[PDB]
Design a binder for this molecule. Structure first.
Ligand code: LMT
Ligand code: LMT
Ligand code: MIY
Ligand code: DDR
Ligand code: 8K6
Ligand code: MYS
Ligand code: MYS
Ligand code: DDQ
Ligand code: D10
Ligand code: D10
Ligand code: HEX
Ligand code: HEX
Ligand code: CL
Lengths: 1033, 156, 48, 48
């Protein structure tokens, strides 16, 4: 095939052009995001029961929906939460590869037929079925700086004027409103209601009658009286549109004739649908939009389009309203592309300089400068064909392959330059011979690298999907590198290179190159003399090899394991957890103190604090809050002192002094769904209807046992909430029946007043919105206020709640968890320093087996992933090694010689481990993929040495040592050129301390260290391996 | 309250005997009450932690402490069927005829859950069998309504 | 083109003064002028 | 696929005849098929 294209360089050019056009098209059209879809498909069912407790939500909604989630395909597990905010969230997680649309519609269809079983209040609110997604493209904050608007006012404006237009913007998938549109709030007064002998039942009855759409009919409708001239629609009662109209809703006409209106017994205003959350941006009231990127869309184009739409909304904003961008990933992704394009350009420039330093003709330097871009472009066309996106993983996947791409270019050209210099053959005849020496090896290398990287794509779960990104990217680039090396590069060499006179090694030149050529030719003799000495005493180097292999194994066990390195993304979260029963006002005071700190003591670093009262990490309630911190530009934060990690540790230490609150800051993970390496996710299950209290006792028993093993387990805690004091009130049925008071009127009065009741819908400025009746705050605060509420008896007498009710304090769950339709309690934790995830999990299982009768357990999330991911590894390592061996055996026509190549692996791994250990980095995916590429390039260097040596023994009938010395002599220059270019290429990645430096360091450090040792050791050890193996067999 | 007052409320509820022991030595407020007015003895009585109930009473805990709805630790212990704690509280001078805001007594609550052994212990310490709640109901009126024929015979 | 609509306005206060329920007014107007789908019957073995 | 040489036959009410007339029509067909043993075997209703 190289011979074919040496005689046909125009054809070779046509193929290169077609590859560049396909790649050029791919670059324009390929989707762009920070990370691809990693997590398995998950569907969330969300329902709201206004004024409902955790047990009410569970026993009327959650259990009913859970019992009906049957006949759905590819369901792995089901988990749910029922809390005291009146909220239920059931998450159904599906097998990796399941169609998320089919998963959703099947869940959604089974819910539809279970809706008639739910309470009418829950049916009225609705039950949302959505595809679970944590990754936002950006968060648009909407604030009011002149203090003329509340958060309710801003939320309504965004919902009416902004949200819909943002949802229609190019590339925008989903948009979440951080708040609600206005609701018609009827704040009832019990003193006024009792005075006119009225109840909340009468208020709800009147609103339903006087705020409604009534169907009338038609004038002259069919069938008509013949001769009818007009046919018109009859409009009757339509919905109310204003607070004025709601205030004029007639409740009662007194005996004297005076009218009781709704404004006489209640305060009426446009307000929030609920008041659980208080959002503040630097102390000012705030709403916002949580924007997700659409499937196959460009993040950079979408973010530009979003800002373009917000820009032409600016002129119609009310006075004081301002747009802020507390969270945006596109500036980070912009830098990621620039830094990767930079690395690839610098790598091509470095190769050009190295190619000229050694070969010293500009014609030679052009062939790699053409070939490498053709391969890179071709790679993009193949990613597009596979349906991949330009993301962090695929971008760094091509950075890690640079070493392999560059080598293919150098190896082909360098080998022609030598053959011409050693024999004096013309370029074309020299190219034919040069390719004849390497073409069989290059194909063998392609299969060996395929055997290494392809099996990495067949890991299951989240980590498998991450490894699949690097696998297909590297295999594709590698595959195209070899095709270009067998088609284009030989054709370029034969047509472009200048003939070298036999014996001309450039020793007779003057200046720098005269010196360099004489220096290097002399250094090549020193090298072959040194190998000659090594090969006289192989025994001691076999011993040194076992020291390296042992040193490698030792450093592997010692190096702490992680998933992805944490980045300074210009943002970090601060958790605020107050004790049980702590009110919204108390939580706000802690949040105000947390905000005041960041704007005073981190004023040079912090740009804004987004304080959300009523929402924590997992839990909700009045005693939970979160402060999302947004930092200034990276340029304004020089040195490690003004970075997220330094600020995090500074803030957490400062907030340990806060009383009656658990406060701490922390960095965001690269991908939230992975969790933590060494971290586990445990479920304790009620398997025999033991009840909540007995599962709590069993949980406490497990937590206490886990605390006795700090050597193995660390921070083993419950993910849920503890039981809180709740106000139990019993209605005396006998007393209610004796006084002639209906239980429906009692439970409606209590529920509507204290809990709030969604009555019906009204139309505010052409938009349908909810009507809520609830007690004015001051009459629903304390147990003494219970008696202030009166219910009308059948005989017309107003009876206070105290007359037919009795109350006491008891403990109950503010958040009830279920797993696979059974009562559960989620337990989080991690393996202790030095211990593996597997060991920690095995102890938890051992501890779990000693719990009371009817108490089971299960592994969920990352722990479910870790188990099914770990069971495959041994098989995928075995297949890789077996196919590598078999491929080398076919190449060399030998069962023994392949061992001389495969013995190179540790030489590159030890250098990576030393660099990672020294710099204090972890065994992350970038490091792990770095090992394979380092192992890959060193394996390729060994293959060409062993091929040259074997061929010399077979063809020219040379001795084992003679062939080995002549081989490593010929292979020295090309190995050094690649190493020099590639090590300098990844030097910027190692020293990088900017944005996205965490990933750059992880990619750079392990590769540089590995390449240094791989290069230094292999040139001395590959000769030893070949000789020892050949002698033995 | 105080810092140690909170830890004692948590420890007493949780049933951590060793932590309660150290807190009593360090002088943790035995009269420390949460927002609903529950002392460590209230919590220990509710969750059925016998040793902590005894340790708290040794360290001068108010045996007749009442919450914001007028309920005492004997009310809690009697209601949730903690026989040993009911006996201990009554030996340390718990008001056997203690009425909450609803007029409910420890005997009413014991009769409601059908705790026969506890009902007998309350009657042994002079529980007013004719005591009526706000709805004029006795412990006997609860037994006939509940259909507990064993309990109804004891109360005569 | 925009059609003319016959807007009828039920005075609920006057209806309440005369002891006439709003549901009976809404149904009477609705059923008479618009036609009201009450329930199903069986015509020659088919639900109609 | 069914038993070696079984058949699955449907008798349809095409003109709102009713259940009683369809039963009589079925009984007629069963009685007719009964006196063709040379061709048909075990022709029976798959109903109550
Ligand atoms: C047999 C005759 C063949 C004809 C060619 C003869 C080659 C040697 C003489 C060339 C004349 C110029 O001489 C040349 O000067 C330059 C500039 O100072 C030197 O410069 C070079 O070598 C010095 C060390 O000596 C290095 O530190 C330097 O990086 C490099 O540029 C060369 O070492 C020297 O060889
Ligand atoms: C842990 C980090 C260090 C590991 C690095 C290992 C590889 C890089 C170091 C290269 C050293 C090779 O250097 C080479 O060593 C051999 C030792 O067998 C010497 O060889 C010497 O001993 C042999 C055996 O008795 C004699 O036959 C030979 O005549 C004598 O010169 C060579 O003169 C020297 O050139
Ligand atoms: C947690 N989340 C992202 C935020 C952040 C800031 C906010 O200011 C808010 C939220 C959640 C949203 C959810 C919405 C929800 N909905 C979309 C209307 C909602 O139904 C509720 C609810 N508790 O039922 C809200 O609290 C809510 O109205 C609300 O007040 C929010 C809100 O104000
Ligand atoms: C030349 C022969 C090379 C053999 C090594 C091939 C390893 C491939 C295993 C595989 O398919 O999965 C890749 C895996 C994804 O989790 O990434 C990794 O874990 C990186 C592997 C580094 C260490 C290799 C073993 C050398 C120790 C002596
Ligand atoms: C030419 C190189 C490409 C070959 C790679 C293909 C390998 C496919 C992986 C198969 C996965 C097997 C998993 C077995 C798990 C069973 C657990 C006991
Ligand atoms: C994945 C490794 C498989 C290795 C298979 C063993 C090969 C044994 C080599 C025997 C060589 C025979 C020498 C000639 C007699
Ligand atoms: C996993 C099954 C395949 C393993 C690889 C087979 C290797 C065969 C080696 C044969 C050696 C023969 C030596 C001849 C003396
Ligand atoms: C199938 C495993 C890969 C082995 C590839 C080795 C190809 C050797 C071809 C040698 N050749 C015929 C060109 O001389
Ligand atoms: C604006 C969208 C087109 C440019 C995207 C950048 C692609 C570069 C990938 C290396
Ligand atoms: C005994 C030490 C000799 C070192 C020889 C290695 C030379 C390599 C230069 C490229
Ligand atoms: C021997 C012909 C090879 C070229 C086909 C791409
Ligand atoms: C990325 C979808 C289109 C791919 C073209 C073959
Ligand atoms: Cl329960």
């Amino acid at each position: 095939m190289p011979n074919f294209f040496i005689d046909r360089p125009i054809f070779a050019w046509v193929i290169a052009i077609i590859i560049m056009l396909a790649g050029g098209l791919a670059i324009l059209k390929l989707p762009v995001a920070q990370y691809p879809t990693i997590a398995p498909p998950a569907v969330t069912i969300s329902a709201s029961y206004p004024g409902a407790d955790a047990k009410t939500v569970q026993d009327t909604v959650t259990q009913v929906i859970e019992q009906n989630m049957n006949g759905i395909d590819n369901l792995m597990y089901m988990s749910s939460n029922s809390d005291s905010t009146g909220t239920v969230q059931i998450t159904l997680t599906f097998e990796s590869g399941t169609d998320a649309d089919i998963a959703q519609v099947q869940v959604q269809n089974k819910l539809q037929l279970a809706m008639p079983l739910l309470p009418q209040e829950v049916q009225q609110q609705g039950v949302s079925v959505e595809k679970s997604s944590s990754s936002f493209l950006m968060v648009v904050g909407v604030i009011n700086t002149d203090g003329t608007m509340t958060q309710e006012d801003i939320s309504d404006y965004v919902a009416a004027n902004m949200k819909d237009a943002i949802s229609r913007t190019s590339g925008v998938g989903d948009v979440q409103l951080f708040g609600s549109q206005y609701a018609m709030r009827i704040w009832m007064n019990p003193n006024e209601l009792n005075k006119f002998q009225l109840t909340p039942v009468d208020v709800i009855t009147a609103i339903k009658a006087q705020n409604a759409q009534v169907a009338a009919g038609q004038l002259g409708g069919t069938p008509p009286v013949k001769g009818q001239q007009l046919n018109a629609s009859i409009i009757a009662q339509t919905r109310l549109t204003s607070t004025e109209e709601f205030g004029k809703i007639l409740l009662k006409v007194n005996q004297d004739g005076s009218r009781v209106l709704l404004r006489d017994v209640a305060k009426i205003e446009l307000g929030g649908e609920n008041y659980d959350i208080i959002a503040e941006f630097n102390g000012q009231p705030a709403s916002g939009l949580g924007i997700k990127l659409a499937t196959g869309a460009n993040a950079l184009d979408t973010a530009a389009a979003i800002r373009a739409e917000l820009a032409k909304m600016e002129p119609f904003f009310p006075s004081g309203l301002k747009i802020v961008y507390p969270y945006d990933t596109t500036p980070f992704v912009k830098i990621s592309i620039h830094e990767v394009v930079k690395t690839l350009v610098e790598a091509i420039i470095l190769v050009f300089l190295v190619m000229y330093l050694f070969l010293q003709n500009f014609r030679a330097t052009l062939i790699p400068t053409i070939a490498v871009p053709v391969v890179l472009l071709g790679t993009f066309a193949v990613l597009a064909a596979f349906g991949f996106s330009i993301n962090t993983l695929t971008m760094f996947g091509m950075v890690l392959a640079i070493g392999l791409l560059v080598d293919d270019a150098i190896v082909v050209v360098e080998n022609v330059e030598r053959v011409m210099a050693e024999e004096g053959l013309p370029p074309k005849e020299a190219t034919r011979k040069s390719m004849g020496q390497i073409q069989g090896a290059l194909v063998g290398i392609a299969m060996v690298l395929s055997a290494v990287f392809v099996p990495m794509a067949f890991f299951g779960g989240s980590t498998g999907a991450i490894y699949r990104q690097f696998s297909i990217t590297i295999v594709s680039a590698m595959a195209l590198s070899v095709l270009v090396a067998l088609i284009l590069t030989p054709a370029l060499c034969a047509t472009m290179l200048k003939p070298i006179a036999k014996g001309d090694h450039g020793e007779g030149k003057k200046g720098f190159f005269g010196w360099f050529n004489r220096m290097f030719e002399k250094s090549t003799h020193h090298y072959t003399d040194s190998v000659g000495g090594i090969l006289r005493s192989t025994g001691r180097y076999l011993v040194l090899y076992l020291i390296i292999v042992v040193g490698m194994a030792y450093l592997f066990v010692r190096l702490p394991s992680s998933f992805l390195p944490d980045e300074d993304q210009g943002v970090f979260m601060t958790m605020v957890q107050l004790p049980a029963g702590a009110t919204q006002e108390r939580t706000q005071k802690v949040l105000n103190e947390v905000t005041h700190y960041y704007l005073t003591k981190e004023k040079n670093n912090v740009e804004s604090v987004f304080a959300v009262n009523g929402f924590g990490f997992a839990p909700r309630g009045q005693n939970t809050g979160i402060a999302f911190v947004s930092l200034k530009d990276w340029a304004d934060r020089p040195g490690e002192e003004n970075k997220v990690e330094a600020i995090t540790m500074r803030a957490t230490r400062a907030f340990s002094q806060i009383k009656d609150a658990m406060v701490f800051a922390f960095n965001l993970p690269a991908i939230v769904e992975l969790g933590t390496a060494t971290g586990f996710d445990f479920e304790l299950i009620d398997q025999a209807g033991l009840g909540h209290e007995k599962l709590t006792q069993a949980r406490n028993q497990l937590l206490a046992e886990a605390a006795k093993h700090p050597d193995m387990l660390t921070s083993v805690r419950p993910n849920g909430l503890e039981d809180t004091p709740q106000f139990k009130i019993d209605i005396d049925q006998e007393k209610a029946q004796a006084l002639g008071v209906s239980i429906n009127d009692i439970n409606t009065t209590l529920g509507a007043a204290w809990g709030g009741s969604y009555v019906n819908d009204f139309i505010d400025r052409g938009r349908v919105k909810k009507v809520y009746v609830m007690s004015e705050a001051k009459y629903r605060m304390l147990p003494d206020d219970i008696g202030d509420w009166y219910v009308r008896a059948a005989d017309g007498q107003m009876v206070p709640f105290s007359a037919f009710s009795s109350s006491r304090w008891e403990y109950g769950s503010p958040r009830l968890e279920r797993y696979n339709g059974l009562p559960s309690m989620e337990i989080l934790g991690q393996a202790a320093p030095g211990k593996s995830t597997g060991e920690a999990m095995e102890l938890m299982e051992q501890l779990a087996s000693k719990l009371p009768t009817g108490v089971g357990y299960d592994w969920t999330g990352m722990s479910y992933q870790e188990r099914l991911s770990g069971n495959q590894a041994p098989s995928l390592y075995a297949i890789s090694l077996i196919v590598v061996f078999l491929c080398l055996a076919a190449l060399y026509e030998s069962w023994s010689i392949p061992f001389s190549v495969m013995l190179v692996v540790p030489l590159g791994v030890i250098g990576a481990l030393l660099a990672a250990t020294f710099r204090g980095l972890t065994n992350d995916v970038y490091f792990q993929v770095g090992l394979l590429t380092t192992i890959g390039l060193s394996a390729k260097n060994a293959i060409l040495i062993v091929e040259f040596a074997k061929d010399l023994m077979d063809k020219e009938g040379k001795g084992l040592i003679e062939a080995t010395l002549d081989a490593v002599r010929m292979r020295l220059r090309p190995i050094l050129m690649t190493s020099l270019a590639f090590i300098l290429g990844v030097m910027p990645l190692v020293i990088s301390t900017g944005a996205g430096s965490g990933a750059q360091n992880a990619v750079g450090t392990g590769v540089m260290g590995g390449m240094v040792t791989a290069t230094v050791l292999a040139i001395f050890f590959v000769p030893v391996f070949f000789v020892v193996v050949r002698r033995r067999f | 309250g105080s810092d140690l007052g909170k830890k004692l409320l948590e420890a007493a509820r949780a049933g951590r005997d060793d932590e309660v022991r150290i807190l009593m030595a360090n002088g943790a407020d035995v009269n420390a009450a949460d927002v609903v007015g529950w002392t460590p003895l209230h919590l220990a009585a509710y969750w059925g932690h016998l040793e902590i109930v005894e340790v708290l009473l040794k360290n001068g805990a108010d045996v007749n402490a009442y919450d914001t709805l007028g309920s005492t630790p004997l009310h809690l212990a009697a209601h949730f069927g903690h026989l040993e704690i009911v006996e201990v509280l009554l030996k340390n001078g718990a008001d056997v005829n203690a009425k909450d805001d609803n007029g409910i007594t420890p005997l009413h609550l014991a009769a409601n859950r059908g705790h026969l052994e506890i009902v007998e212990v309350l009657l042994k310490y002079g529980a007013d069998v004719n005591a009526q709640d706000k709805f004029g109901k006795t412990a006997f009126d609860i037994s006939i309504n509940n259909g507990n024929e064993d309990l109804a015979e004891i109360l005569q």
